[PDB]
């Protein structure tokens, strides 16, 4: 039985008082998150090679995760069973080193460590034909599945509220990579395709964006015994929303009353990237990412996103170091124009299982410290039926009301664990 | 630590739009799998052999159940813990050979693959003396429990609705097995009592069946490289509505709105099965099925059922084959005589870990075709209480309304994987 | 992978009718087990060292609980996460064989097994330093917190039904153990301050106590090819409620209508423990436990509890054996004075893995018998609004109504496995 997986889990406070707070910039999709992390989360992994033949062999996986507020001892909790797949190598005789899968599987997720951010992932239940050996690289193909909560209507109807069926949408991706593209660098090419596939005789809003692209090119090249990546991703429509490779092809919402909204996502999305790790010298190691997102949207709801931070790490001894991570944050409202902001500063003392800055098990002792000044923030007040604004970036004061985190400051510190297996 | 368990998992669509769907006869108990399956289904099993001395030793035994939709990744659930036994072999002198156990265990389950069908499964928390050799075939003795929903009152009362309290039964089971009747065939007979158990002073409706008898006789003749099972069993009363071995002796019911009806059961149920597998030479292997069941009772609305099948599976290389299933349905509505039906048609590709139609991982890739005409169904529309044929088998047409699935064909196809280990 | 856990489940009923019942005394916090457990309970663990270094580890420790009817087949359940830690050993140097840990663990619990009652207990999220050695001794430093439901109020108001914020509580705890006060035995001394932690700006209602201490002594002496506990604690206000080392200073509590009402805690809490396992020959073995707690509350709704009871075994063989327990419970109203009392005596025919008292897997077969006679019990009929005695002590025939669990008898009798691995 082959066992991995990741966890984290805590102790922590906040200066002003009470249990431990986290920070995160209205309107940005992640926080930096050395000492600014808040659940106890976990997957536990149990897989195994259940039959091999020479070259041919078939490998089973699972994946349960759990996700719990670490404020007590006895927490119960829906689990979620994430994966349960089965892969089979060198099956087919003529392509060769290529494998078929079919099941609920995690597929080759790209994401930033620091934080936490995925930029490419279209995991889900699904089917593909992985490493083909094309000579100048590897291609591979697959079919993945999700589906939005409701949006599709048993009739035509003109009222929003009468589309409350699950509507599924589909996946289709090819990606061609290891090419060889310079001496240390590598290029990955990909293209996701993803549709709202409706039942017999269903119908989706009118003006509901349907269908959408995904395109993506990473570049990896390799340096100061690390590595850096940079890419370039651009999407269309319904994959402008989750913006990782998933399709929200329906643009219909739900307030916690039931009601339906409307979440529209005709308009486009551009992605910039460059992240990585090195290491200078013996002493030395530091992460860093640098990125600019925007979406545009027909409905002038839209953000301008900025984001800039690095891990630092100096090593005392080949088990004790001092981390220390900057982070900053800016989003601007498309509909406004106004413009949301924050940076982050966590200085810690670790003990490792390594000399890297990615290895792990961790312990950490912290103290973080946090000052914003947001300008403007979603309406979320009200009933999407009470309000016409449900929903709709708005300004900090709008209608005497408060919208945003405030202009403030804080501080927290404690005690966690983290670890891959 | 010993990891067991069984998990399938995949992804579909349908030809007129949307996500897969499966078909099952109105009024039937099973639908034929290929490629008719809409579920992630999965069973973890985690085990150990915690003491030996000798022939002496105790086994530990668990198994966590889950069940998701597929339609994607996170998909939080309530996991079922089905067992938590311990088996001690051999702790008796005097009874050699024989195990002792108690906790939650499924017990000797006998069931139709192709079908999903169990056919005799008295599984649930328990405990048994197991394998007494008698000489001519061993002995083996247990008790298992199960428990409605509500059923009883705490005091006597002519309403239904009084009738709340989860009313409990017990199983009462004997078996003696592995009896050569003949050369290459073998004959297992069996006799199940159960019975509602009711608090001190709690009472039961009127009319109530209380208990029941299930009578289970079961030859299996080695064949073909393969073997046939034939089994003939009868119930009385309360082993009729689940027919498994379990009873339900309270004979009350619930409408989603907790209202509660009169599902009484006192009748009796016949059945006639027959299934098998055998393999023809090196490239044929074929699982079959036929069953006759009828459940006749005192009310009427009882069903006469009919089932065929047959999965050849041609190998053209000993892990490529291609397999196919064919199954029909026909069920007569004892309420009403009128007959619903339907014939199902799949063909798949799969890749498996083995040259037989029993082993597995397995992949596939699948096409299948469904064609009904169902005449009947069951009526369900409205409230317990403002319905009067709550539950009734009604026609199709039945006050302008149409129950059943209608007279019409459908078509799915996708990719899926199946195991145990 | 490491595998470990604990495990409880099986089979009964009850004399006069159905399933299977235990027996408590009203205002007892404990039960005699044997014969008297109506769950399946169980803890499924998987750790694993994942990295060794000379002395220097890192082991990494996790556990799943799962409690279910056991009363059917398929019971789906909530399953409670309860730790996920990571523990450094010998990582620093000038404190040798200590560990640093931090995760949600179960730290150091001392309990009573025949009772299932846990004496000192702070387990949940935190972090630490272990084993630090002191020459004389060693001592140990931890944090862990725990967080009550509501409590807390986000303005001062006079009305109760304000106070539902959640109100975290922080444990800080020092020990000095495995000190040979004598020859053969041992002293462990322990302090513990417990606080409510709020809100910048929240604040609790007037009177709540806020904070408290506990106080613990151990002495483990060892005698009988065995070892005898004994031991002395003393609690104040916050620390009283729970008792056995989380603090609970908010005083507010909520009926099912989730009305708040005032459990204030202020006052003491003194108990006197007296308990352990001795072998006196080669057929005999012996469990025993003597207590007696005092709380007395400001309020007048305190109790002052005894116990005693004995599990002497006497082993036929070694595998096979006789256990029998008895106990007994009183509990006397500090509100009212009346008394509540009970004892039970069960005999049973066991099978374990081992010639102790204190080896499992053990299957058992059984028979219990009790008799109680409860003059007093909690007012819970009502509503937290609808009632002002709510939660109170009161008489048993208070107002016509009847309270306690008044003067009855009663058997059951079953089968069941328990075993930790």
Chains 1, 2, 3 share one sequence.
């Not at 992460?287 to 690095?310: C, E, F, P, S």
């Not at 039926?385 to 510190?413: I, Q, Y």
Request: hydrophobic share 35%.
């Amino acid at each position: 039985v082959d066992f991995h997986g990741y966890a984290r889990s805590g102790i922590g406070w906040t200066g002003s008082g009470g249990e431990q707070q986290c920070f995160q910039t209205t309107g940005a999709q992640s926080k930096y998150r050395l000492g600014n992390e808040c659940e106890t989360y976990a997957e536990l992994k149990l897989g195994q090679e259940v039959w091999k033949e020479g070259d041919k062999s078939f490998y089973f996986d699972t994946n349960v995760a759990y996700s719990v507020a670490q404020q007590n001892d006895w927490e119960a909790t829906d689990p979620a069973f994430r994966e349960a797949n089965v892969q089979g190598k060198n099956l087919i005789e003529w392509l060769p080193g290529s494998t078929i899968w079919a099941g609920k599987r995690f597929y080759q997720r790209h994401d930033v460590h620091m934080i936490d951010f995925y930029y490419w992932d279209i995991s889900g239940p699904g089917a593909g034909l992985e490493n083909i050996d094309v000579g100048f690289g590897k291609l591979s193909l697959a079919a993945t599945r999700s589906s939005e909560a409701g949006g599709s209507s048993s009739f035509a109807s003109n009222n929003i509220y009468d589309y409350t069926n699950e509507t599924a949408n589909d996946v289709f991706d090819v990606r061609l990579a290891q090419m060889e593209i310079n001496p240390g660098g590598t290029l990955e090419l990909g293209v996701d395709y993803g549709r709202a596939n409706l039942r017999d005789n269903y119908r989706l809003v009118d003006g509901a964006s349907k269908d959408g692209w995904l395109f993506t090119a990473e570049h990896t090249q390799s340096v100061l015994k690390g590595f850096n990546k940079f890419v370039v991703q651009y999407a269309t429509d319904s994959m402008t929303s989750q913006g990782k490779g998933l399709s929200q092809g329906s643009g219909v919402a739900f307030d916690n009353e039931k009601f339906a909204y409307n979440i529209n996502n005709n308009g486009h999305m551009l992605r910039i990237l460059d992240h990585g790790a090195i290491s200078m010298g013996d002493n030395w190691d530091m992460m860093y990412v640098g990125m600019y997102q925007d979406i545009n949207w027909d409905n002038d709801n839209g953000t301008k996103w900025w984001t800039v931070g690095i891990r630092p790490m100096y090593k005392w001894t080949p088990i004790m170091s001092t981390v220390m991570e900057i982070g900053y944050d800016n989003v601007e409202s498309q509909r406004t124009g106004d413009k949301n902001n924050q940076y982050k500063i966590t200085l810690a003392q670790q003990w490792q299982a390594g000399d890297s800055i990615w290895s792990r098990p961790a312990i950490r002792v912290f103290a973080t410290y946090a000052k914003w000044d947001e300008k403007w923030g979603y309406d979320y007040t009200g009933n999407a039926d009470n309000n016409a604004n449900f929903g709709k970036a708005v300004p900090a004061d709008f209608n005497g009301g408060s919208f945003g985190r405030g202009d403030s400051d804080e501080w927290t510190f404690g005690a966690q664990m983290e670890i891959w297996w």
